[PDB]
Structure formats: C-alpha cells, structure tokens
Amino acid sequence: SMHSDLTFCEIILMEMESHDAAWPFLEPVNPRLVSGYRRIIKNPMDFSTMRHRLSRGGYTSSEEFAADALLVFDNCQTFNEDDSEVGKAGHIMRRFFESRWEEFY
Numbered sequence: 001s002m003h004s005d006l007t008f009c010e011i012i013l014m015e016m017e018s019h020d021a022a023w024p025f026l027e028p029v030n031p032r033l034v035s036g037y038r039r040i041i042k043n044p045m046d047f048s049t050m051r052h053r054l055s056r057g058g059y060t061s062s063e064e065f066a067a068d069a070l071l072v073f074d075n076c077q078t079f080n081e082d083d084s085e086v087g088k089a090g091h092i093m094r095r096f097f098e099s100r101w102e103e104f105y
C-alpha cells in the first residue's frame with residue numbers, strides 16, 4: 001500500500017480529478033469512442049490507473065507519480081490537435097499539475 005510520505009501526491013491527484021478540465025483523463029482512453037489510439041500511443045495513462053497504482057504501493061517515489069502525470073499530458077498532445085476540446089484540456093491540466101508540483105519542488 002501507499003507510504004504516507006506520498007500523501008501529498010494522493011492529494012494532487014484528487015485535485016486533478018476534480019478539475020473542470022480533467023474529464024478526458026479520468027479513465028483509460030476508450031476504444032469504444034476512438035480508433036487507432038494504442039496504435040500510436042505506446043504507454044497509455046489516465047488518472048484512475050494512477051489512483052489505483054498509488055494506493056496499492058505501485059509508486060515508490062513521487063518522481064514516478066509525476067512521470068505518469070506528465071505521460072497523460074504528453075500522450076494527449078501526441079494524439080490530439082491543440083485546438084480540439086481534449087487537446088485544450090490537456091494543456092490546462094499540465095499547467096495545473098505543474099503549479100501544484102512547484103509548491104513542493
């Protein structure tokens with residue numbers, strides 16, 4: 001299970017999930033809604049996957065948590081055009097994440 005020293009990450013993730021721009025990223029990208037995603041994106045990531053990994057002890061360090069957060073946003077900008085609704089949401093969420101991370105680092 002998660003070590004208590006990572007509680008600050010648990011909180012950041014909770015706040016990200018609650019953000020107005022988080023809706024694209026809550027669950028894995030869904031093949032029922034778009035084709036050819038895993039064809040291009042080799043390491044899919046989403047906030048529910050992160051939440052369960054963090055709670056079960058799958059992240060030893062805050063750096064691993066942050067790398068998965070950035071992977072969400074990196075995948076988003078790889079797959080989606082900046083002008084799309086999902087693309088714009090990824091940019092909002094990256095800024096929000098970086099602002100919360102910078103309080104600690």
Ligand SMILES: CCc1c(-c2csc(CN3CCC(N)CC3)n2)[nH]c(C)c1C(C)=O
Nearest residue numbers: 023024025029030033034037076079080086
């Ligand atoms: C399919 C487009 C997409 C969504 C997306 C579209 S709709 C949604 C949330 N939506 C809520 C209602 C549920 N019934 C189904 C899922 N996420 N997200 C991401 C990260 C996408 C891509 C291609 O990068």
Ligand SMILES: CCc1c(-c2csc(CN3CCC(N)CC3)n2)[nH]c(C)c1C(C)=O
Nearest residue numbers: 020021023024030032033034084085086089
């Ligand atoms: C979440 C609804 C949805 C969208 C979608 C994309 S864009 C949009 C409207 N809208 C614009 C501004 C945002 N702040 C919130 C959502 N709904 N696509 C798909 C395939 C959906 C489902 C039900 O599967």
